[PDB]
């Protein structure tokens, strides 16, 4: 990863994390407090005092 002196480690994917996302993508993925998008409730989680 020697690109003539430029340092792309911030945008290139990070293999260590289980999600192969670069640190900037992780940051801006944690910032957005998105809702639930198509989970499989199984109807058991739905019933309860949640």
């Amino acid at each position: 990863k020697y690109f003539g002196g430029f340092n792309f480690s911030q945008i290139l994917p990070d293999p260590s994390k289980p999600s192969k996302r670069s640190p900037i993508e992780d940051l801006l993925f944690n910032k957005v407090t998105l809702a639930d998008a198509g989970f499989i409730k199984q109807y058991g989680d739905c019933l309860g005092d949640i």
Partner: protein, 50 residues
């Protein structure tokens, strides 16, 4: 009403009979005989696709 009745752990205040939720739909009820507070949940569903 139609649905599955289940043991709600939540506690009513003695003088009011049954609970609700966001909509004005019954979400809990006190059994007349043993005075038990119950959950209510419509049976599972979801559209099919071919």
């Amino acid at each position: 009403g139609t649905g599955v009745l289940t043991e709600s752990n939540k506690k009513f205040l003695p003088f009011q009979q049954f609970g609700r939720d966001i909509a004005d739909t019954t979400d809990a009820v006190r059994d007349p005989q043993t005075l038990e507070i119950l959950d209510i949940t419509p049976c599972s569903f979801g559209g099919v696709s071919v």
